[PDB]
């Protein structure tokens, strides 16, 4: 059972593989599946046996693009997985939120909207879809955008077209923009906060 692991490890420790093999008390198919079953952040694993007494293991992990709800994570391709927080918390990632089957759907929004916002240097820190399919975004500068259920792109354009006049308005009265609520035909409501 002498062990040689190949692959781009970021989350999986040696001791995870050691303790998956030790867990059985052997066959290359059984242990591949067992690594799968005990490491939920493994996407692919191939286990080739090798003389003398070696197990050469190829590991492919999921690669989070975002935290998903809070405890979990989601990769670019819509995969929902979990890493124990101990190994996750030095990372700074965007937060996605959705009801439990909806990662692919939230991620699709997240891409479209984040991409639009990137074109004027706003970046998405959180994006939250509700069961109702209402959308509430958080920018890096902690401005929350309330998009509701409708045309989210059109309302997001409103925010961008209207942001400069809010920033001088905020400058003047010496206050930060707290949120922008775009649940309107053609308008937007702006909540303010004291400066930090």
């Amino acid at each position: 059972s002498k062990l040689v692991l190949t692959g781009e490890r970021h989350y999986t420790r040696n001791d995870d593989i050691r303790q998956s093999i030790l867990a059985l008390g052997q066959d290359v198919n059984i242990i591949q599946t067992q690594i799968e079953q005990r490491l939920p952040w493994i996407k692919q694993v191939s286990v080739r046996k090798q003389w003398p007494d070696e197990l050469k293991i190829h590991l492919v992990e999921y690669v989070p693009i975002a935290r998903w709800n809070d405890q979990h994570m989601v990769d670019a391709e819509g995969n929902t997985f979990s890493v124990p927080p101990e190994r996750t918390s030095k990372q700074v990632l965007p937060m996605l939120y959705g009801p439990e089957g909806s990662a692919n759907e939230v991620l699709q929004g997240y891409r479209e909207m984040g991409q639009m916002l990137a074109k004027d240097r706003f970046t998405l820190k959180e994006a939250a879809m509700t069961a109702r399919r209402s959308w509430q975004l958080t920018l890096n500068n902690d401005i929350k955008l309330n998009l509701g259920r409708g045309d989210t792109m059109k309302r997001l354009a409103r925010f961008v077209e209207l942001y400069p006049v809010l920033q001088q308005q905020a400058q003047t009265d010496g206050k930060r923009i707290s949120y922008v609520d775009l649940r309107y035909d053609s308008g937007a409501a702006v909540g303010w906060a004291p400066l930090p």
């Binding site: 509700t130 509701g148 409103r158 035909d185």
Partner: peptide, 24 residues
Amino acid sequence: QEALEERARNELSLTRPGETFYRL
């Protein structure tokens, strides 16, 4: 409830007090 606030703003152009409204 959030549904209500949403309707409150979109159908009536309501606001919470202390917010600024802009139309575009």
